[PDB]
Write an enzyme that holds these catalytic residues in place. Structure first.
Site, mmCIF file in Angstrom:
data_model
loop_
_atom_site.group_PDB
_atom_site.id
_atom_site.type_symbol
_atom_site.label_atom_id
_atom_site.label_comp_id
_atom_site.label_asym_id
_atom_site.label_seq_id
_atom_site.Cartn_x
_atom_site.Cartn_y
_atom_site.Cartn_z
ATOM 1 N N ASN A 91 -4.237 5.557 -0.916
ATOM 2 C CA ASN A 91 -4.818 5.512 -2.232
ATOM 3 C C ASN A 91 -3.737 5.260 -3.301
ATOM 4 O O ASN A 91 -2.546 5.153 -3.008
ATOM 5 C CB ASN A 91 -5.523 6.846 -2.563
ATOM 6 C CG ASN A 91 -4.533 7.929 -3.034
ATOM 7 O OD1 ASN A 91 -3.704 8.406 -2.253
ATOM 8 N ND2 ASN A 91 -4.588 8.277 -4.312
ATOM 9 N N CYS A 147 -2.264 7.120 -5.319
ATOM 10 C CA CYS A 147 -1.134 8.069 -5.405
ATOM 11 C C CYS A 147 -0.485 8.400 -4.076
ATOM 12 O O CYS A 147 0.384 9.258 -4.010
ATOM 13 C CB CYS A 147 -1.593 9.354 -6.050
ATOM 14 S SG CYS A 147 -2.073 9.139 -7.776
ATOM 15 N N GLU A 182 -1.592 9.829 -1.295
ATOM 16 C CA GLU A 182 -1.843 11.088 -0.617
ATOM 17 C C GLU A 182 -2.995 11.026 0.369
ATOM 18 O O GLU A 182 -2.991 11.736 1.361
ATOM 19 C CB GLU A 182 -2.047 12.242 -1.617
ATOM 20 C CG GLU A 182 -3.502 12.508 -2.001
ATOM 21 C CD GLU A 182 -3.943 11.866 -3.318
ATOM 22 O OE1 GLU A 182 -4.904 12.412 -3.926
ATOM 23 O OE2 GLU A 182 -3.344 10.839 -3.744
#
Lengths: 6, 640, 640, 6
Positions: free
Chosen positions: B327, B329, B331
């Protein structure tokens, strides 16, 4: 190239 | 107006004056609930709990989270919290009452989009989406683009993978024309973004790779850039090997070399290798690409690095098929396909809330029982969110209902360490890291198993690592640390299932850790001075306690980055406890990340900080993470 | 290889070497036909007819129309022609043989896309598409964008109308956000264009109008432009009136003022007026917009001007519903809707081919019988094209099958006048203009009626002006000039129908008039020197015939624009016959356009040329066209 | 405004 001092 | 039900009446009854349209800001559903229970709901709110947020913490709510009527603030903070509790829990008043208290008491919070939308008529409570590019064709490319536009309409991040789009010069049927590649198509998604953030996921054997990693470069030669898109590399192990052996690396166009992104590990190495021997692509020196990566990261902090094989080999979703991206970010690691868009259901536990100063003077402990307990609560919440969420596109609905992935995280790691007087690189910190994550994983798995008993296992359970009693740390070939009883858990899991395919993915916390007064998730402090201008309150308290908080400090501190090393008058223990992230070896950072990772279902956003960055130091830092088996080798590179 | 069937074998058997894919450049269908008839087909070709094209005429074929194999030319010009004949006519060998001869003999040609694709496997023979914006919503806007991308993939122009998209600041459900308008959405279509030309159609009461007419401005303040899109105004009569009365004009957002673009004439004036009185928009002075139009046209030649009411009131498609736009070149006026994308099926008659120098010395005549005859042939062709065309999107297929609109045109008007020694502003030219168009309209209508007898009327005939015996000139309230017998035609039409809803729309001719050695369609000559460097061959012949073709000419002519007025040694008759378009009153241009228009089903591309352009002269030029009842008041404005 | 000499 590869300096392990981080 | 100073009473929750009255506030609900107002938001519910609101009419857009400038237009004459009734614009209800509460859903019917939550309206009726508040009404049918006004007394209990109204008298449960403790308004004393509003002055528990800092000045700049409370002003982040006001600035942007508290619902407003005519540009004027309609909600007190507890109304917000109570609103969210209900939006999450519906008719379950006892559950809502519990969520209210624990959030108001700051044990945990929920991601921004939950805070914004929970309780309101189109409640998009989910923090981000991972999209598959539907097909290498105009139809496919425009169908995806539409879908992102629909998604990017109710905001929330997108992680898009584009390994299957052919590269510049590739052949096209029924025309003399040759393909223009990724960059011009990226450009289309850029423009759609700006019109309605984006991460793009690519495997480094893609022939447009050199241009793709330069997406965020500053010397922009007009047409070949594309900004507020973030490039992320989906790196297979083979790439890292070629780079360290100083060997070759071949670029392919997915049409001349199909399937690469639909296998991992040895199946990928055979398929890849067989494609090299068959002369399907263009060979270069592995290190020419490597050097361009490092060059791009040093100037722009991107592309991010997420290891494809680590991700797939150690995912409880491996029964689904191959996972093609993370994704925005870095994570979340969840399956996506043309008709399944994976969703991120996020919440974070407040680590410091579990410190307890017990029968004595200076002893602090850590209440791991309360931690386990709260993480069971948040697990239950994130399940409801799955069911009660508004899905902006059908693909998202299918993905969430089918595999029910959950994404728990943390905030106030650095704070916890400091309050407990533990240097981030202490052995005690190393141990607390492990136990904290052991207990969260154990809790969410336990709670998720309970749910499977009531409501059944997620549709896709049979055939999964968990179903075979293979849990995350098993796929790391490690014994659990052993604070909790994993045998009993695993035995129950094999018997009843769990409700959630996945459960942990410590993320960036941004504004939801700001409101609560804590530090960015699990990274340490970047400074002992943020900005106005306020000093790390723990460092602050200690400098007062020593009287040395004379002006030879507030000034010094700001014109030193907020560092305390080599202050002449400060005890060595304080020095060790308040290192800046620039003063912690990235080697420790990565180690602690590797420690906690055997307890992370998904991945975590591992920002990396380098002081005097050389291409060699970066290279050691990537390989170190790589060999530690990390899924996310690097989120952003912050430098200088 | 010097034999049509062998050339067909080659193009048919071709394999893309660099890839190993068989890449047939003839359809199966046309392959088999050539094979089943190789002898007749092979021996019908007259290769003598290749040196009938000029140097730069033949080199336009070679440069871009003749099929190629490995960058080397695979087709002789007659093969091209024969290929097209077949692609058009299929199993109808006699028909194909007739088309071959008449094209090879240069009586008429077909639009570029027909020339490129006729005979080949995905034969997109149609010259352009008119697209309706499907709905004022992300879904709607992205569904349209996809459709244009699919269309813009097999090239050919697009005319898009966007009257229904809300304007900046307009309200949006479920969010605090306000709409950004047209300009940012235009920007998305710009980027899609560049990734895979566009005309955009707007009614001047749209609130984003000031920015929309400036789409092509040079002083581009980054984000508010958008280039290789062409803005076109869809002007209602009310606008022109307010401008001439110096009154007010109100801008609306289509959501506060719905339906405006779904009525015309008096119904529109009542609805519009009622919206003004109800205080739904923002009133300004008509002339502030007028002045901005003129300002934009003077610098960029755009927006084009097409009169909405003229178009709708005088369209045989008025039984369909209201027509919302024209096409990229301002000649087509056909219905479009979310599920009907109108298609332009184009061909042009070569006007000079019908001049005949008869039993005498210097007498020339015009063979109107042969003209009528050939236009019957081209009418039949354009019907086949409808049936045998490849439709890039379903909407286009629905539109063409349902109403069967056809689009005949011309080229070599200026040449015809000159060969017949008629000044463009002579009364004889005025008369020939009328008769030429009378006979084309009469022919295409006759031929189209014959087709209705064989195959039935188009699905949508019952209820149309034609079905009531109201033909185009009737809707102009004029008697036909009377060269042909319109009673009998109209009587047959009312009895049997016609196959084509529409039939005439003289267009730009660009490269298809170049190949044949003639001048841009129906405009006069822009210069007596094009560029290399060659002089108008008729002017040329006359200067030789007078010996004065001494160097005090080839030089003079180029450093004078190619004008002959005020040459000291040239007879006045030559002066009058070889006026540059800059030397013909735009008043005559418009008159001749108005004359021929009562015979045009659709519209025509009326370029306008102004010498010392003032805002006042432009204003008189727009109103003059307007009051003459023209549908297209202006295509480009060329100036200076 | 209205110059009829075009």
């Amino acid at each position: 190239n590869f300096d392990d001092d981080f | 107006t100073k009473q929750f039900s009255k506030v609900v009446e107002d938001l519910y009854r609101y009419v857009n004056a400038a237009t004459g349209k009734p614009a209800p800001m509460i859903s019917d559903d939550v309206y009726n609930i508040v009404m049918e229970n006004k007394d209990k709901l109204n008298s449960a709110i403790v308004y004393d709990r509003d002055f528990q947020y800092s000045y700049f913490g409370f002003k982040t709510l006001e600035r942007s989270y508290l619902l407003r009527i005519n540009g004027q603030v309609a909600e007190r903070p507890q109304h917000l919290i109570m609103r969210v509790a209900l939006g999450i829990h519906g008719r379950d008043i006892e559950a809502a009452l519990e969520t209210y208290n624990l959030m108001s008491l700051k044990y945990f919070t929920h991601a921004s989009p939950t805070l914004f939308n929970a309780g309101t008529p189109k409640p998009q409570m989910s923090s981000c989406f991972l999209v598959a590019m539907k097909e290498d064709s105009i139809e496919g490319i425009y169908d995806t683009l539409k879908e992102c536009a629909l998604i990017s309409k109710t905001a929330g991040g997108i992680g898009l993978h584009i390994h299957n789009i052919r590269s510049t010069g590739s052949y096209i049927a029924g025309t003399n024309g040759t393909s223009n590649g990724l960059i011009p198509m990226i450009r289309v998604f850029n423009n759609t973004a700006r019109y309605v953030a984006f991460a793009l996921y690519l495997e480094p054997w893609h022939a447009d790779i050199f241009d793709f990693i330069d997406i965020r470069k500053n010397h922009g030669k007009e047409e070949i850039r594309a900004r507020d898109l973030f490039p992320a590399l989906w790196i297979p192990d083979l790439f890292m090997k070629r780079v360290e052996e100083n060997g070759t690396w071949t670029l392919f166009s997915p049409t001349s070399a199909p399937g690469l992104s639909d296998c991992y590990g040895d199946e990928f190495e055979a398929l890849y290798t067989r494609y090299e021997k068959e002369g399907r692509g263009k060979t270069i020196k592995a290190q020419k690409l490597w050097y361009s990566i490092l060059e791009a990261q040093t100037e722009t902090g991107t592309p991010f690095v997420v290891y494809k094989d680590a991700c797939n080999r150690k995912s409880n979703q491996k029964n689904l098929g191959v996972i093609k991206s993370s994704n925005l970010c870095c994570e979340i690691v969840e399956y996506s396909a043309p008709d399944e868009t994976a969703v991120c259901n996020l919440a974070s536990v407040a680590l410091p809330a579990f410190i307890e100063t017990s029968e004595d003077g200076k002893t602090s402990t850590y209440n791991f029982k309360k931690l386990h307990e709260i993480a069971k609560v948040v697990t239950r919440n994130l399940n409801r969110v799955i069911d009660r969420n508004y899905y902006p596109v059908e693909e998202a609905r299918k993905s969430n209902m089918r595999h029910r992935p959950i994404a728990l995280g943390v905030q106030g790691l650095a704070d916890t360490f400091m309050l407990l007087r533990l240097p981030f690189d202490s052995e005690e910190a190393r141990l607390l890291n492990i136990q904290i994550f052991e207990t969260i994983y154990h809790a969410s798995m336990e709670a998720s198993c309970e749910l499977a008993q009531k409501d059944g296992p997620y549709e896709t359970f049979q055939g999964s690592p968990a179903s075979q009693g293979i849990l995350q740390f098993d796929m790391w070939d490690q014994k659990p640390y052993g604070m909790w009883d994993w045998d009993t858990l695993r035995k129950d899991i094999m018997k009843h299932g769990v409700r959630n395919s996945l459960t942990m993915a410590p993320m960036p916390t941004a504004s939801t850790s700001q409101i609560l007064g804590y530090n960015e998730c699990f990274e340490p402090v970047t400074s002992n001075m943020y900005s106005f201008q306020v000093v790390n309150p723990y460092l602050l308290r200690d400098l007062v306690d020593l009287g040395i908080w004379d002006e030879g400090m507030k000034q010094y501190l700001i014109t030193q980055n907020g560092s305390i090393q080599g202050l002449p008058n400060v005890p060595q223990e304080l020095k060790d406890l308040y290192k800046t992230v620039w003063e912690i070896s990235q080697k420790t950072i990565i180690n602690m990340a590797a420690d906690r990772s055997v307890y992370i279902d998904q991945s975590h956003s591992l920002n990396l900080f380098l002081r005097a960055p050389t291409m060699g130091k970066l290279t050691s830092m990537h390989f170190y993470g790589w060999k530690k088996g990390l899924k996310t080798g690097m989120y952003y590179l912050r430098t200088q």
